[PDB]
Every structure is written in structure tokens, then in C-alpha cells.
Amino acid sequence: KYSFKCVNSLKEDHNQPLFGVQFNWHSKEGDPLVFATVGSNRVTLYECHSQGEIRLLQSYVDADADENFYTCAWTYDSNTSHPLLAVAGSRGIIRIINPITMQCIKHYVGHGNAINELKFHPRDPNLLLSVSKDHALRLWNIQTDTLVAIFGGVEGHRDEVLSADYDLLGEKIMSCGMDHSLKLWRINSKRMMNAIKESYDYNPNKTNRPFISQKIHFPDFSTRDIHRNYVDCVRWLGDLILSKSCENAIVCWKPGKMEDDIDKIKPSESNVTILGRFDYSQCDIWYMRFSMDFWQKMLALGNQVGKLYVWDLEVCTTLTHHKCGAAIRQTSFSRDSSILIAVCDDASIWRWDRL
Numbered sequence: 001k002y003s004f005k006c007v008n009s010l011k012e013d014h015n016q017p018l019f020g021v022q023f024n025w026h027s028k029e030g031d032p033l034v035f036a037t038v039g040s041n042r043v044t045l046y047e048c049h050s051q052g053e054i055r056l057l058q059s060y061v062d063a064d065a066d067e068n069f070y071t072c073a074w075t076y077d078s079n080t081s082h083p084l085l086a087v088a089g090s091r092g093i094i095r096i097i098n099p100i101t102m103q104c105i106k107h108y109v110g111h112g113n114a115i116n117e118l119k120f121h122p123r124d125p126n127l128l129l130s131v132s133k134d135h136a137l138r139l140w141n142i143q144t145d146t147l148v149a150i151f152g153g154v155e156g157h158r159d160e161v162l163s164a165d166y167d168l169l170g171e172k173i174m175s176c177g178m179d180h181s182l183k184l185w186r187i188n189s190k191r192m193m194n195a196i197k198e199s200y201d202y203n204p205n206k207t208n209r210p211f212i213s214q215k216i217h218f219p220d221f222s223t224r225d226i227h228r229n230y231v232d233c234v235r236w237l238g239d240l241i242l243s244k245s246c247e248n249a250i251v252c253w254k255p256g257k258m259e260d261d262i263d264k265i266k267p268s269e270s271n272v273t274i275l276g277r278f279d280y281s282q283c284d285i286w287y288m289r290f291s292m293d294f295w296q297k298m299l300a301l302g303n304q305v306g307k308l309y310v311w312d313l314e315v316c317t318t319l320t321h322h323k324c325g326a327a328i329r330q331t332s333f334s335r336d337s338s339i340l341i342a343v344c345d346d347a348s349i350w351r352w353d354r355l
């Protein structure tokens with residue numbers, strides 16, 4: 001059903017892989033569609049214009065040349081509506097950047113180990129989730145600069161956490177990593193809702209107390225039975241999960257037996273139910289993300305030879321350009337799903353417009 005035309009492409013002059021791309025879904029009405037790209041020590045902003053024009057807006061060039069940005073996530077200021085961009089990578093430093101000036105206005109350091117993904121809470125623009133090479137997830141309140149919670153320990157991830165996703169309402173997180181496992185962490189518990197509330201009440205200039213972070217050691221569910229390799233991308237599709245490894249499939253599955261409710265699932269739940277698989281080829285290298293559009297009506301995944309697969313989630317289109325031959329690391333749909341951006345290993349950017 002869905003068709004796209006390649007209207008433009010470009011290459012960033014650093015020639016390093018671009019690991020992340022995100023459209024700003026908080027962009028204002030009347031303003032051009034903006035997306036950010038991340039790779040090497042750079043964060044770059046582009047505007048989408050008519051006649052397929054991809055206009056370079058601005059760039060952040062990190063002071064440390066050895067920084068490798070792996071992820072970016074947009075949010076907005078809850079009082080003014082002004083957009084902000086969160087970036088992080090190999091250095092383990094979260095940077096909150098003002099996109100108008102490219103000023104780093106806030107930075108956070110957990111233990112300083114590489115951050116593989118950032119995600120903002122779907123209902124709270126101040127709640128930032130980070131997943132790290134150090135096997136833990138961290139939840140930050142960027143309004144009060146507090147570490148709300150650390151998810152991990154011997155019962156948490158036993159290797160790098162590579163991806164995570166909040167559900168629709170931001171009541172729970174599903175995480176995944178190098179340990180082959182997918183873990184559930186409920187954040188609508190009395191303990192977590194209280195912690196989030198206290199994070200808002202914290203002001204270090206009016207007290208001598210440190211802000212106490214929750215140490216969440218036990219996940220609400222765990223499975224190692226979906227994939228047989230590094231699980232590098234996870235996303236909620238309602239109460240269901242979409243996840244992939246490097247085994248040439250995106251698996252749609254759920255914790256428990258076929259008719260088990262996600263909110264009745266106990267931590268000891270030993271079963272999983274696979275609902276289906278999105279099969280494809282030549283996407284067996286590690287660290288390849290899939291994306292969905294805002295409405296979760298489309299699913300897109302680039303492969304390691306520059307093909308871009310798009311599935312209709314309501315019922316497969318293959319987007320290919322004879323000059324697009326590098327690994328597509330991540331894709332991003334604009335909020336209205338009219339544009340799909342693919343970023344590559346060779347620092348190239350490809351613009352596909354929906355017909």
C-alpha cells in the first residue's frame with residue numbers, strides 16, 4: 001500500500017557512521033520539518049524543504065574528538081514549549097542541547113560508561129531514560145537534574161543494554177541487550193511514582209540532603225527466548241513487543257501465554273508468546289535500528305546493503321536507490337509520516353517522500 005520516492009541525498013564531511021537520526025516531533029506548525037543526525041563527535045540539524053531540499057541548519061561539534069554519539073532524543077521545555085535535544089554516546093555523558101544555538105545547557109554523568117540509547121517518557125518531557133554499556137538503565141529528571149532510578153544488578157542485565165522503550169502511557173519500560181534478554185521494568189509502582197514526585201520536589205540550593213536514587217534490582221519480567229543473539233532494538237506496539245536481533249527478523253511477541261494480560265504478568269512468568277515475525281534479508285550485522293511512525297501504522301528498517309524495508313502494520317515495500325549501498329543504521333519518519341530519513345555507515349543521508 002505505502003509508496004515512497006527518493007527526492008534527495010547528501011553525505012556529511014566526516015565520513016564516519018551516522019548511528020542515529022530523529023525528526024523533531026515537537027516542531028511548531030508553520031515551521032519546517034527538522035531532523036537531527038548523530039555520529040562521530042557531531043550532532044547535526046537539517047530542515048526539510050520543497051524540491052527535496054535538505055537544508056543544513058546547524059551543528060554541534062563536541063570538544064572531545066574521541067566522542068562517538070550513538071543516540072539522540074527530542075523533548076521540549078514543559079513551560080515554554082521550546083524544543084531540546086538529548087545526545088549521548090561512547091563517553092557516557094548525556095548532553096541537553098538547545099537546538100536554536102547548539103549550546104549544551106545541561107549534562108549528566110552516571111558512571112561514565114557508553115550510553116547506547118536515550119528515550120523520553122511519552123507523557124513527561126522531563127523524564128529521560130538512558131541505557132548503558134555498564135548493564136544498567138538510568139531514569140533522569142532533566143527539570144531538577146536528578147537521577148530518579150538505576151535499573152540493574154545481578155537480576156538485571158548481565159551485559160550491555162542496547163535499547164529500551166516506554167509503553168504508550170509511560171507505565172513500564174522494556175529493555176534489551178547483548179545478554180539476549182528482554183526485561184520489563186514497571187515505573188507505575190508506588191515506589192517509582194513516589195520517586196518521580198520527590199525528584200520534582202528536589203532543589204539542591206535549598207537543602208543539604210542528597211537526592212536519593214531508587215536502586216531497582218528486580219525486573220517485572222525477563223525472557224531470553226525470543227532471540228539467539230544481541231537484541232539491539234525494542235519497541236512497544238500497544239501491549240505487544242517488537243524486537244530484533246541480527247537474525248534477519250523483527251519478532252512480535254508478548255510476555256506470558258496467548259491470553260495473559262500484560263498487567264497480570266508476574267516477575268516469575270516463564271512463558272512468552274510469539275505473534276509473528278517480519279522477515280527480511282542482509283540485516284545480520286549488529287546495531288541496526290527499526291523505527292515506527294508516530295501513528296504506529298508503519299514500521300521501517302534499513303539493511304546492511306542500503307535497502308530500506310517498510311511494512312504496513314494495519315494489514316512490504318522495498319526502498320532502494322542505485323547509489324545507496326552502505327548500512328542504514330537508523331531511519332526516522334516525520335510526525336505527519338510524509339518524509340522518511342535514512343542515515344548510513346558512510347555518513348550519507350537519504351530522503352524518501354511518501355506518495
Ligand SMILES: COc1ccc(F)c(C[C@@H]2CCc3c(C(C)C)nc(N)n3C2)c1
Nearest residue numbers: 019070116160162232287288289329330
Ligand atoms: C544503530 O543501531 C544501534 C543499535 C543498538 C545500539 F546499542 C547502538 C549504539 C552503539 C553502536 C556502536 C557500538 C559499538 C562499536 C564500538 C562496535 N558497540 C556497541 N555496543 N555499540 C552500540 C546502535
